Amino acid sequence: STIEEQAKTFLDKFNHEAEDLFYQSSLASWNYNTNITEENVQNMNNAGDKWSAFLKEQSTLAQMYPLQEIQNLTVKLQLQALQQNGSSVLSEDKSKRLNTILNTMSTIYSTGKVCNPDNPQECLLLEPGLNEIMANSLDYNERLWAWESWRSEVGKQLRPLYEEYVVLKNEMARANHYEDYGDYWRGDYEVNGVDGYDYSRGQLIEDVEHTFEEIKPLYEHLHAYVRAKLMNAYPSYISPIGCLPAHLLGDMWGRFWTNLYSLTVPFGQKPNIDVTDAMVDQAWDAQRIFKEAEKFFVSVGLPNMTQGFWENSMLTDPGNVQKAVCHPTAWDLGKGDFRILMCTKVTMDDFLTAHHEMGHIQYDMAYAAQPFLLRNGANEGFHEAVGEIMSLSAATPKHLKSIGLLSPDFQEDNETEINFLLKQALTIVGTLPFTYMLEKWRWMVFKGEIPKDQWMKKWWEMKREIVGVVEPVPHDETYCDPASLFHVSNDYSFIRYYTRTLYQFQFQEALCQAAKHEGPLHKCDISNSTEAGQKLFNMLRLGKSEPWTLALENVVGAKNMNVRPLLNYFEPLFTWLKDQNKNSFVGWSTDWSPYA
Amino acid sequence: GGNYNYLYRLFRKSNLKPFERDISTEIYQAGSTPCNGVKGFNCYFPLQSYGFQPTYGVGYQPYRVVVLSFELLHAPATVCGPKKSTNLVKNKCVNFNF
Ligand SMILES: *[C@@H]1O[C@H](CO)[C@@H](O)[C@H](O)[C@H]1NC(C)=O
């Protein structure tokens, strides 16, 4: 008879058990994180296995509804969220093979072990050591050797595994009403409900590169300045016509260029803004750090955290043999239980980390009234964006002086502002082209357009053309270079790490207009601004119940995905670089290589 | 470890009358498929047990609630509040409410 009325009853029956079972699983995971021991291992085992073996029946029964007639949008979305069969669309043997291949690639990638040929008794791991040697040093031979070692003894076995992983995943997508794995990655980023806010999978596909050309000159100016600094430092190791090699960046895969700020610092005479002395001298412990960090949150307008979070959650000093994980995480156990997991120290870095964690807690509690299936952000790029906005607005010297963390007689000038802008850019814009090229290559390889053999050459040529990174040493076809990365053997969509920064400044820009603040965007602050909190919370409380296209309307007034505020942020840096690369050409030619 | 000794009705065919109590454990039939007292294609249990724990947040922890309803039926009144009395005095013209 009825199919939409009983859908409500089925959803309620599922949610009532799902909430408490997820609470139990989260409690067990938190207990083992606090109690790293054998006894707490079976706790997570018997929580997670029960959760999966119970959600499997909920997924099974959530197909008896012909989801083409339910009038309610929320009910339809909730039922579709469970109508997916996950990876249970292939055969049992195919699924077992896929699980085994993912397990073996995950185990292999986490077993870095390369010795020096002269001393084969000292291998090195991806832990500090091998990475530390090539990340913090002024050398060209040993750093290149380490770069080759991590990409040769580990980069050869990942290719056969990835070759079967790609084809099996694409076959699963084809059996899953998807042309490829890329559209499955974008299945979440597709809303087809209310008119005017419809988003298709190809919209992001053809919009990522549409807005990419605008950020090209900003990256090119920084690239030219870094290359000129490399001439100033490395004698005749980089061609001015071309570009700098890969391993000389400072990172194994060239994601970040922050470690190269030491060799590219314009004005090192003025010290960077550090309040470690201020907090240490005035006796600021971890609890005082949290208390002073939440003052900004309550001044913006976010509600104060309830009692119980300060008690159940661990804060600082794991201390004795009872160890604890130091990974900053935000726990939403359910039933009104929120907790933090931190190893807080007396540091500005820990200050910003605590601000990020508080932002995560606030956004997690924002959608508390949502159902179990809708207690999440509108998309994947809002939690981290909200977390980093507070860190951006807390590192401003004006806020530090406001909270009495800086000397009131400060004489901040354009020199230190330019230096801080350059340092922030070296971390922010230094990864956006790399993220774009990696995501584009993954999309193309999962689309099947490029054959199995034509993998390395296309990747290298498009990295040279877009990012401008040349190969310090020649590479052969059997190398699987992109596979030697964290979010390639763990099945992680990496486009999410691209839009959120573009959202961040937009939000900041909007917050700037919701700040009544006149001046530079980096000095724009929302301290004591209640409107900035109310406008944000009006969308934060919505959660995933509303489309993210509709969600991105109460803060920024433009639905279009255009990179307005990123260039506005680095305007002093852009105008200083224009006066810097006057006699040095901006750009690169894909014709010069260190080996040829 | 989790207390599940308190249950609440989640589904019933008809709403409760003013001052009405339902304790029947009859299996609910959400859909049009009748069930012979067992869960099935469209049958679910009306009663759900809370999972009250000391670690639960505000608004989820158990609360003891007592409702006092006062009735004044035509029968003679039985329950009335206390009446306080003062001290007596003598040999002075006063007014009294013995
Ligand atoms: C942590 O686990 C150990 C067993 O490995 C147990 O003896 C101890 O009581 C536990 N501590 C807490 C706080 O649960």
DSSP track, B30-55: -SS---SSS--SSEE-SEEE--B-TT
Terminal C-alpha separation, chain B: 60
Q: What is the secondary structure of A313-335 as a DSSP string? A: SB-S---SSS------EEEEEET
Helices (runs of H) and strands (runs of E) counted in chain B = 0, 4
A39 touches A111 (CB < 8 A): no
DSSP code of residue A303: P
Indicate the SS3 state at residue A595: coil
- Closest Cα to residue B26, out of B37, B39, B10? B37
Rounded CA separation A259/A354 (Å): 23
Which residue puts its alpha carbon closest to atom 1 of ligand 1?
A: A35
Tokens representing A269 are 């005479």
- A397 φ, ψ (degrees, to nearest 5): -60, -30
Q: CA A58 to CA A56: how far, in whole Å?
A: 5
What is the Cα A471 distance to its own chain's centre? Answer: 26
Q: How far is CA A515 from the centre of its chain?
A: 27
Active-site hit among A357, A380, A388, A509: A357
Rounded CA separation A18/A31 (Å): 20
Say if CB A346 and CB A286 are below 8 A apart.
yes
Give the CA count within 13 Å in the CB-facing half-sphere of A368. Answer: 17
Name which residue sits closest to atom 12 of ligand 1, judged by CA: A35
Question: Between helices A216-233 and A414-428, what is the axis angle to 10°?
Answer: 100
Return the SS3 of B28: strand
Q: DSSP labels for A333-379?
A: EETTEEEEE----SSHHHHHHHHHHHHHHHHHHHTTTS-GGG-S-SS
State both tokens at A328: 């900053």
Spell out the residues 6+ positions from residue A138 whose beta carbon is closer than 8 angstroms to its own: none
Give the side-chain half-sphere CA count within 13 A for B97: 5
Residue A245 phi, psi (nearest 5)? -70, -175
| Cα A154 to Cα A408: distance, rounded to the nearest angstrom | 53
Residue A63: left (phi > 0), alpha (psi -120 to 50), or beta? alpha
Cβ burial A28-38 (10 Å sphere, 16+ → b, else e): bbbebbbeeee
The encoded tokens of residue A525 equal 């602050």
CA pair distance A281, A463, nearest whole angstrom: 48
Angle in degrees, CA A60, A63, A67, rounded to 5: 155
Amino acid at A457: K
Instruction: Measure A383 CA to ligand 1 centroid, in angstroms.
Output: 33
Backbone φ, ψ for residue A558 (5° rounding): -105, 125
Evaluate whether B22 touches B9 at the Cβ level (below 8 Å). Answer: yes
Q: Measured between alpha carbons, how far is residue A366 from residues A12, A304, A332, A370, A531 in Å?
A: 22, 12, 11, 9, 16
Q: Is A72 in the pocket of ligand 1 (CB under 6 A)?
A: no
Distance CA A223, CA A587 (A): 8
Which of A489, A506, A492 shows the shortest CA–CA distance to A555?
A506
Indicate left, alpha or beta for B35 from its phi (over 0: left) and psi (-120 to 50: alpha).
beta
Cα–Cα–Cα angle for A185, A189, A190, nearest 5°? 110
Q: For the packed helices A216-233 and A571-578, what is the interaxial angle rounded to 10 degrees?
A: 50
Q: How far does CA A302 lie from the centroid of its chain?
A: 24
CA distance A265 to A569: 19
Which of A49, A55, A47 minimizes the C-alpha distance to A82?
Answer: A55
> How far are the Cα atoms of A71, A235, A363, A540, B39 from residue B31, in angstroms, in the given order?
18, 79, 38, 36, 12
- SS3 state at A136: coil
- Asked if A151 contacts A251 with a C-beta cutoff of 8 angstroms, the reply is no
Q: Which pair of structure tokens corresponds to residue B94? A: 């006063």
Place of tokens 């007034």: A557
Neighbours of A303 (CB within 10 A): 12
Q: Is B65 exposed, middle or buried (0-12, 13-18, 19+ CB in 10 A)?
A: exposed
Q: Which two tokens stand for residue A568?
A: 């506005």
Question: Which residues lie below 8 Å from residue A517, measured CB to CB, with a gap of 6+?
Answer: A523, A524, A525, A526
DSSP sequence for A30-43: HHHHHS-SSTTHHH
Q: Which two tokens stand for residue A115?
A: 């010795």
Closest to A337 in 3D by CA, of B48, B49, B1, B52? B52
Query: Other C-beta atoms within 10 Å of A494: how many?
Result: 16
**Number of residues assigned to chain B:** 98
B50 touches chain A (CB under 8 A): no
What are A330's strand-pairing partners?
A340
Residue A487 bears catalytic tag: yes
Q: How far is CA A541 from the centre of its chain?
A: 22
C-beta atoms surrounding A443 within 10 Å: 19
Distance CA B38, CA A527 (A): 60
Q: Give the residue, by CA position, lying nearest to ligand 1 atom 8.
A: A35
Q: Which two tokens stand for residue A193?
A: 């409900």
Looking at residue A288, its amino acid is R
Which of A209, A207, A168, A200 minimizes the C-alpha distance to A448? Answer: A168
Contact B56 A336 (CB under 8 A): yes
Residue of A nearest to B53 (CA): A335
Give a three-class secondary structure readout of A463-477. HHHHHCCECCCCCCC
The helix or strand, by DSSP H or E, that contains position B8, with its residue range, turns out to be strand B7-9
Treating both helix axes as pointing N-terminal to C-terminal, what angle do A383-394 and A496-513 enclose, rounded to 10 degrees? 50
Inter-helix orientation angle A158-175/A92-109, to 10°: 140
* A353, A387 contact by CB (below 8 A): no
Gap from B26 CA to chain A (nearest CA, Å): 16
**CA angle A290-A530-A572, nearest 5°?**
80
Q: Kindly give, in sequence order, each residue whose CB lies less than 8 Å from that of residue B66, ignoring residues fewer than 6 positions away.
A: none
C-alpha A169/C-alpha A447 separation (Å) is 11
Rounded CA Rg of chain B: 26
| Backbone CA torsion sign across A20, A25, A28, A30 | negative
Local structure of residue A176 (DSSP, 8 states): T
Answer for the pair A363, A355: CB distance below 8 angstroms, yes or no: no
Distances, alpha carbon A36 to alpha carbons A30, A41, A69, A321, in Å = 10, 8, 49, 10
Q: Which of A39, A320, A321 has most ligand 1 atoms within 8 Å of its beta carbon, as the pocket-test mutant?
A: A39
Q: Does B48 touch chain A (CB under 8 A)?
A: yes
H/E stretch holding A83 reads helix A73-83
Give A314's strand partners: A341
Count how many Cα atoms sit within 13 Å of the Cα of residue A365 in the half-sphere of its side chain. Answer: 21
Place of tokens 């977390």: A387
Rounded Cα gap, residues A80 and A84, in angstroms: 7
A523 vs A569: CA distance, rounded Å = 10
- Per-residue burial over A519-536, b if 16 or more Cβ lie within 10 Å, else e, is ebbbbbbbbebeebbebb
The H or E element spanning position A46 is helix A41-61
SS3 A393: helix
Please report, to the nearest 10 degrees, the dihedral formed by the alpha carbons of residues A58, A64, A67, A72 taken in order.
Answer: -70
Is the distance from the beta carbon of residue A518 to the nearest atom of ligand 1 less than 6 Å? no
- State the Cα–Cα distance between residues A469 and A590, nearest whole angstrom: 9
Q: How many CB pairs under 8 A join A and B?
A: 44
Within a 10 A sphere around the Cβ of A190, how many other Cβ atoms?
15
Containing H/E element for A17?
helix A5-34
Per CB-CB distance under 8 Å, the chain A contacts of B6 are: none
Residues A18 and A55 sit within 8 Å (Cβ to Cβ): yes
Residue A306 has its nearest CB partner, among B44, B48, B57, at B57
Residue A88 touches chain B, beta carbons under 8 Å: no
Q: Is residue A378 a contact partner of residue A402, using CB atoms and an 8 Å limit?
A: no
Chain A residues within an 8 Å CB radius of B60: 335-336
Which residues does chain B have within 8 Å of residue A335's beta carbon, measured at their own beta carbons? 51, 53, 56-57, 60
For residue A148, the surrounding DSSP H or E stretch is: helix A141-152
Which residues are bridge partners to B67 per DSSP?
none
Can you tell me which residue has the tokens 């009663």? B47
Give the tokens for residue A574: 């852009």
CB contact B60 to A (< 8 Å) = yes
A228, HSE (Cβ side, Cα atoms, 13 Å): 17
Residue A314's alpha-carbon distances to A35, A318, A324, in angstroms, are: 11, 8, 9
Residue nearest to atom 10 of ligand 1 (CA): A35
